[PDB]
């Protein structure tokens, strides 16, 4: 194939892909159906 | 030339005699500390004369 | 810029002046007899108490009265405080005629504030 790309680079974008979907959950405690607001 | 217990603790305070800093030395450090001291003596002479009277000094017998 | 204090003085500022006028006629009291005879820390009761409410009360000349004469009216209200700093801190001096002339200063500024600003 020889299309290999440095893992470290996709270690960031998978890591901040993990970070935005657990950062969205802590946004969701503060508006929505469980927020007591 | 009599050694005592006293004189074997002060002879390093009086071991040298003519050891001297080199030529012209730390003279103008002493000069600018003198010129600050004469200006300080000139200030306090006219504090007391009331000729460099300031606010809230009033050199007088109304004091503590 | 508002001249007409219809309810603005008659409910607020004529109760602003009324509460510290009420401490004022009382003030020839035990407090003068404290500095006459012999009670050191009940003056510090009075300075942070009945004179603690003479000053935290006398604080909203900003928040109710005439913002052109506001910056000249701060330091009128600051000199009444800062002379009464000498009243409570001459209690550790233990000599009650440095505090007695400090109390006579509170005649020169409190009623001079009360003579001023009917607006």
């Amino acid at each position: 194939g020889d299309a290999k790309l440095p893992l470290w680079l996709i270690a960031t974008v998978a890591g901040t892909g993990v970070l935005v979907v657990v950062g969205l959950f802590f946004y969701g405690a503060y508006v929505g159906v469980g927020s007591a607001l | 030339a009599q050694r005592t217990w006293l004189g074997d603790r002060l002879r390093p305070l009086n071991s040298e005699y003519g050891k001297v800093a080199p030529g012209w030395g730390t003279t103008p450090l002493m000069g600018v500390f003198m010129g600050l001291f004469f200006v300080f003596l000139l200030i306090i002479l006219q504090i007391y004369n009331s000729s460099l009277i300031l606010e809230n000094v009033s050199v007088d017998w109304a004091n503590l | 810029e508002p001249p007409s204090y219809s309810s603005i003085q008659l409910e607020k500022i004529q109760e602003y002046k009324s509460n510290i006028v009420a401490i004022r006629d009382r003030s020839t009291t035990e407090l003068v007899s404290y500095i006459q005879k012999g009670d050191w820390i009940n003056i510090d009761n009075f300075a942070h108490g009945p004179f603690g409410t003479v000053l935290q009360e006398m604080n909203y000349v900003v928040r109710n009265l005439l913002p052109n004469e506001q910056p000249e009216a701060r330091k009128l209200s600051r000199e009444v405080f800062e002379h009464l700093q000498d009243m409570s801190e001459a209690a550790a001096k233990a000599d009650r005629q440095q505090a007695a002339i400090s109390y006579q200063e509170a005649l020169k500024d409190l009623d001079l504030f009360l003579s001023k600003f009917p607006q």
Binding site: - | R11, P12, S15, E16, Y17, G18, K19, V20, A21, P22 | -
Partner: protein
């Protein structure tokens, strides 16, 4: 001239100033277990041989520089330390001659060419 109704000299070598990060004069270190010796415990007749040697350590260094060969330093120093081991301190000589070297190469900071010559020649005096 005895007298002492006006004059007496000496000293100099102290705390004046300077900020410089230049002129690396091979830094001198003290050997461990060294203390500076007092003159009163040492003796005035014992130190008058001592202080003339300190001029004599550089007087032969000035002789060897114009001689163009460090042989006269490297032949009048071998076993001088084991001669003076009884009287003088061996540790006091190394720290004196090192700062004699370092202060001399500080005087040669302007020429930039003979300073590395005397650094070769003073190092013969230290290593011998």
């Amino acid at each position: 001239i005895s007298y002492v109704d006006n004059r007496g000299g000496g000293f100099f070598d102290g705390i004046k100033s300077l900020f410089q990060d230049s002129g690396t004069g091979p830094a001198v270190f003290l050997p461990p277990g060294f203390r500076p010796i007092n003159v009163s415990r040492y003796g005035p007749g014992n130190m008058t041989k001592s202080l003339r040697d300190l001029s004599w350590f550089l007087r032969y260094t000035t002789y060897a520089i114009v001689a163009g060969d460090p042989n006269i330093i490297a032949v009048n120093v071998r076993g001088l330390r084991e001669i003076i081991e009884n009287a003088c301190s061996s540790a006091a000589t190394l720290v004196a001659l090192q700062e004699m070297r370092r202060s001399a190469l500080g005087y040669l900071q302007n020429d930039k060419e003979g300073q590395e010559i005397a650094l070769q020649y003073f190092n013969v005096l230290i290593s011998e």
